[PDB]
């Protein structure tokens, strides 16, 4: 779990190999690429209530709002099954109507 202990980046597994006076390790690593840009927001306001994502982050390309994971882009329609309510959004900074 600790970053950069064995291998570079996120670690998956390893294979050991023998040597005349030592050992040789082969680490398999996971590395992302091909980044993009998006406009985000921390919270969603609806009917005077505050909505937060159960797991992930809010994204929007300009006209619609979707929720995706931290390390991949598979947008899904926002529903009440992947969000929870906590109080009213009056003190939250960055709220957006939706």
């Amino acid at each position: 779990k600790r970053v950069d202990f064995c291998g570079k980046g996120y670690h998956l597994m390893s294979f050991p190999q023998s040597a005349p006076h030592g050992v040789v390790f082969l680490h398999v690593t996971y590395v992302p690429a091909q980044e993009k840009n998006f406009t985000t927001a921390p919270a969603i306001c609806h009917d005077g209530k505050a909505h937060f994502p159960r797991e992930g982050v809010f994204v929007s390309n300009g006209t619609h709002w979707f929720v995706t994971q931290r390390n991949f882009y598979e947008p899904q329609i926002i529903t009440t099954d992947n969000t929870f309510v906590s109080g009213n959004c009056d003190v939250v900074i960055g709220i957006v109507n939706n």
Binding site: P32, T40, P42, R70, S86
Partner: peptide
């Protein structure tokens, strides 16, 4: 791990709090 990303500080704080077991609502 890979290449740097632009992320606002507030969401990084929220993720760090979520890492230890406290819901992100407390920070906001």
């Amino acid at each position: 791990a890979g290449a740097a990303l632009q992320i606002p500080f507030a969401m990084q704080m929220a993720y760090r709090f979520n890492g230890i077991g406290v819901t992100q609502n407390v920070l906001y």
